[PDB]
Point group: D2
């Protein structure tokens, strides 16, 4: 019998994990969908819970030996409801979805028939692929393959959801399901208006709270559970848990449908097999923490840090999509600054500032993203405050200046020409990038980081 540790069993994987750990510690991790989960969550996820098959629901399993798995799943469900301040007679929860996308697809499967109509926020306006996405030449999202999705849009001149136009187009298109929630929407959502619009056409109403779940849990943002029928979420991002998903649903019939029975059946036996109990373990851990005063303080700090960063970017004369943010993220419209997000993302990454390019309202080309998305959750977890997020803004500004300089110096007009130029060993702004990286890492490495 041999059961070596990772350093003994697999030096290459061990080494790679160590490099990634090294990278996380010294980088400014500004991806709005990333966080740093706890040592406790990691210990539950890296446990023997992975070994068990438990298809079905607690007390209602296909296989034997599930006494402790059932205790865990019941505990996890109770903590999910408690974290979002829900009465268990009004709301149920399924904690088995493997991720945010499968959670959404299970909802669609539960309440819609194939080719039924869905409306969600348009992808280039801050939406998520799983709410539907079609190009001129293909159905890109599985949502747009199996269902008939039509987007609603921001007023491109403002960067806020055009509720009046949604009202008009919903009346014409007659969706069965309207989805609120977004991947890159910097403002809070008018949930009352979504309800009015859904009722106008007898639609189901869902909130995908993946990006804002912890802010909702901490009552920093408005509560979608006051207005919607169904709520989906990832358990990573805002909630700072393991990689997984959850679906919350009203237990009272909605449009004559028992959502509990429909959603549970869609998850299993509909779409998934055995639950990932190791993940469910981690989720229960994170949901306990979600109820704590420290988590509430953390989420308020998230929004204060994003505000500090936004204000300083604006002082450097950047334009923000929608003019600001009410949440954990900001979208910088780089077009007025004379550059795009693809170019800026690469230079910033080379200096250990990690974020992503993001499309901006008005972008001519989907293949050239006009902006960058920046989030505060991950570095807020590490204990950075408002002053440090102002420094982050200055470091970003320095990075964008380097990117602008690199753009002018590259002869080629194409994004790929920019990439070849910056990655070449004769790249002439290497020392400016190193100087920036030195400052970035000098900030990041002053702070602890959670994990095993």
């Amino acid at each position: 019998f041999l059961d070596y540790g990772l350093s003994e069993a697999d030096p290459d994987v061990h080494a790679i994990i160590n490099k990634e750990k090294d990278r996380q510690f010294r980088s400014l991790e500004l991806i709005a969908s990333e966080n740093f989960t706890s040592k406790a969550v990691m210990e539950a996820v890296g446990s023997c819970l992975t070994n068990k098959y438990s298809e079905g629901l607690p007390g209602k399993r296909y296989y034997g030996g599930n006494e402790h798995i059932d205790e865990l799943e019941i505990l996890c469900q109770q903590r999910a409801l408690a974290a979002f301040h829900l009465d268990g007679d009004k709301w149920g929860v399924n904690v088995q979805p493997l991720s945010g996308s499968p959670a959404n697809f299970a909802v669609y499967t539960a309440i819609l028939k194939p080719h039924d109509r869905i409306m969600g926020l348009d992808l280039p306006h801050g939406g998520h692929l799983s709410h539907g996405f079609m190009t001129a030449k293909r159905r890109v999202s599985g949502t747009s393959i199996y269902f008939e999705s039509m987007p609603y849009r921001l007023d491109e001149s403002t960067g806020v959801i055009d509720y009046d136009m949604l009202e008009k187009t919903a009346a014409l298109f007659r969706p069965k399901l309207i989805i609120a929630g977004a991947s890159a929407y910097p403002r809070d959502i008018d949930y009352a208006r979504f309800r009015k619009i859904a009722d106008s056409v007898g639609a189901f109403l869902m909130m995908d709270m993946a990006h804002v779940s912890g802010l909702i849990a901490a009552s920093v943002l408005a509560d979608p559970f006051e207005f919607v029928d169904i709520v989906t979420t990832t358990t990573h991002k805002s909630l700072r848990g393991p990689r997984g998903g959850m679906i919350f649903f009203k237990k009272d019939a909605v449009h004559g449908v028992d959502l509990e029975s429909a959603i549970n059946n869609a998850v299993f036996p509909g779409l998934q097999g055995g639950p990932h109990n190791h993940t469910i373990g981690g989720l229960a851990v994170c949901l306990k923490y979600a109820q704590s005063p420290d988590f509430k303080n953390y989420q308020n700090q998230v929004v204060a840090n994003c505000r500090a960063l936004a204000n300083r970017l604006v002082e450097h004369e950047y334009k923000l999509v929608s003019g600001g943010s009410d949440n954990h993220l900001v979208l910088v419209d780089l077009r007025p600054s004379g550059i795009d997000g693809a170019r800026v993302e690469k230079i910033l990454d080379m200096a250990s500032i990690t974020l992503n390019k993001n499309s901006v309202p008005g972008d001519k080309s989907a293949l050239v993203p006009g902006g960058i998305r920046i989030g505060s959750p991950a570095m807020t977890t590490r204990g950075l405050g408002e002053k440090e997020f102002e420094l982050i803004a200055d470091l970003i500004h320095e990075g964008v200046r380097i990117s602008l300089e690199a753009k002018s110096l590259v002869s080629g007009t194409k994004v790929q020409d920019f990439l070849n130029f910056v990655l070449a060993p004769e790249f002439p702004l290497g020392d400016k990038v190193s100087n920036l990286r030195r400052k970035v890492e000098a900030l990041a490495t002053q702070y602890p980081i959670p994990g095993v």
Copy 2:
């Protein structure tokens, strides 16, 4: 800053995990889809890899900061190919699927249009729900909602796939995709015959090797890659890795279709979002082990142990479906013994023997399965040999005798009647169950268990 460990942060979850670890340790785990993953796999799965967003493929991501994630995913893909002895110019692999069910649904999304025709082994005859399942009342599986599935069946008198009838029904139904592979099939599959049948109608041909992947990697069973276009698998079960999935595909065009592009696009952006890099890390670890001489020895012992158990059960005059097994599992037809699998499963579980009820070909009641499925992988991993599996058969036989005695003594005629009776504190065979449990636990606890 506070980053307590699990015992400190969440005593309730910590205690549950300890109880589950110990239950696994003192039980005979005979669920054919269960195994005990390694310490090294758990270490990778419980690492900081969980923190990274990396939508896309290596070298082509939608976020910064992916240097090390890309190294890991490339390593994982190259190990997957090596474990199955595949030339990378002819075979590709996607290691992102979240589990076996999403792996399969991604394949269907890649190569089929909604409502295209699929044939898989019937669920009551050892098939998996993800290959399609409909009752008289409804479409149960997502596969049967979004696609048009029609089963192929065993010859009910032999328990072997009725290849002649599949030939005839494929010619009539004209499936776009034929699926080989099963959850509870005790024999090797005639892949050459599947290729003949697929070609007769121009169908794509897939193998779902979830239950047999390790046996294939070790060359104990026949290689499906000699005959099929696409192979899907869970990474847990036979491969003894983390909970996840993989899809392998030919890189030469099949029926005019670029499978690489189709399958990769179906996984992302089609159906999933960010890959679970912690799982991918664990997968890379298990795929290294899968190539080792010890893994080959293990897989040969799995088959030898199943054979030792089967033969001893036959000495106790149990009937096996198909007359035996070529693999890691056996199906006991309990009907001639005068009992069903639902009843036997529960008593065995009370005695710390975990297996599952299973439908037998010819079962009249879908609700009341006539058999049990027993697998050797998990206890083989702990180091049990043929003598010990012979003792397992005796203990099972002892449990079935208790179950028969229990079935006789309960007045109630339904399964739920049997359950209430066996769980009553005045249950008259409790001492027989406890005595059996002592013997079971006295055997199990002689062997170590892997994991952290």
Copy 3:
């Protein structure tokens, strides 16, 4: 062998036809979709052409004996092209559709896949039901069952197609097909604007000219063939042919599609069997006449007569949707007059004036149509001129006044209670209706009626 004439073979059917001759002679037929076909058409329709099976296309049939049927179909195609002034190198035609709805469904089948998206004018705004129609809880049109339809609407303040809103909703919905044409639209269509909008989303563009085909043939209205890809039509309404349909199509590839082969294959073998050669014979007859100067004079009289009626109704203080008409019909909004179209239709019918109740923009419910649709083609065929159409307006006005008086005598608010009151044998406005009927019949019986 006996082959009696109808009067001997079937006295009851002969009697029914004689009654119908009487009804046609005595009545003012103002149903905008009705007309009177010629004796010559009727003699072709009532011939031995009905005996022949001729599946396929001329010179390419699946039945022998089709030399003369081939002759006829080619002649019919030649005449259809000449009647609409079309270059046969640029346009083809299929003359086999059995009616307008199946003609439209054949087009959809040819160029779309099931559940592809279609936009047509909303039924309650005077659209054709076969362009798509769904209520709050059912898909009523087959078009809306098999395809995904979303309407476009009139500007309610002008009664004209809201082209600006169509431009916006098309961009969001992304129809594969946009349909122009209407059952109750009193204006010509901006084909250039439809082309612009279609091109903005890469849609096919079709005109359904069923109601206006003769006006188009006579160059009274704009030519859709200057801008659209596909034109469908009935043969009975405006062309004064037999009951049937035709589909015209570009012969140059449109969006990579050979419309000729696609359309021909959808008609047969896709949706229909053997062509109705008696109908095709009658159609050929009417298409000869459609080229004549007298047909052109007739179509100009149609519009002049509608103008005369429209102007006199406005003198009687009726509101017309869109303030008038460019074509053969008026849509009268009766809401300001204090009564609905269902009550008025019935009273007018009792007085031998046949027309249709019709929804009007701004109506709350389809159950209470606010208007009546009135058309000049049928009575223009009989020889009525502008002065006689002014007299018709006066007669309609008398009928509306009787309806208002009747309404005041009915206790209920339900349309059924009105119907019961006005049909009751002692209905106290019987003398008024009788007096109006005498005026109506005294106008009608001054004019002959074509036919055998």
Copy 4:
């Protein structure tokens, strides 16, 4: 205005009808689906009923109105029920379908959802295309586009429907609708066995009696109304009416569905616009005649004539599919004679014998049909008896002999080369064809032909 007769209005169309009348008079019309309708039917179809409006789109249901009452339609319905010996409390009928194929499609639309499963007799084994047909390359029938069709087949050794295999394949495929009836099946149908099989999967059961309706009305063949839920038919073929269709249905709920409401709504407004009252007029006329003793004698003569022909063809050493016929047609397997149906059909057409090439069970390709379909109804209508049908068999045999001689003179295998050879002005078997044609026409012209 003018109202010229056809000879004056359109001498070209008049000349074509003159030619077709002569062709019908001079030829042996042996197409099994053809017949000669009566003068009385033609007089009704060629009447002012074409200008009658009964109902039109959008229809009374749209406005929430009552059932439309029409004297001619009611008469037609009463006569249809009477002709088939049906109790009107148990059966209803819709007489509005425009032909057989749209009648069938309306049934599917009424009782099925898109992509629901249908089984019908395979096209190459004598099925009808509207029951479903797909090649390896494409969905040819609209039925197979909008629904999921799977065929059932004949036992190729007997030429009879393989009821045992249908039982098996229905249990696997689980159709929602099973269709009985055929275009080229020479035997009666075991309706009791279809009912048994339909009930085994909870399927609706329909009979398409288009080819055999008159034999059913006359009690020559078994009554499908004893067993099925729905019966469709053409009105032209066996009933000898105008070109049209009908749908009969049970009035008691079937599988919880009100068939009356469903079917009526699918026909109109679902799939068609207003009824064709001229056709309904002709239908009423033929349904009166269908109740007469003379019609019953006629239908018995149809069977006797087919038997005389069949027996004489066997004397000439032709093989008949199924070894004979119970009905109005025979399917001759020409493979033992060394020639295909396409070549034979052509030569026979040249000698004024009109019939159809037809696939034979066991043919390798649909591109080379192995047989010919020959029917007695049309020439039976003209007054031919058994002796004359024996002469017809002799004349067919002469034409087959000519075809074989022609085949030997042609260089190569391509049917086009055969066609060019036989149509060449100096075709060297022209005198043999002319001598046969003279015999054919000398027989045909002894008999009158019905019609105006």
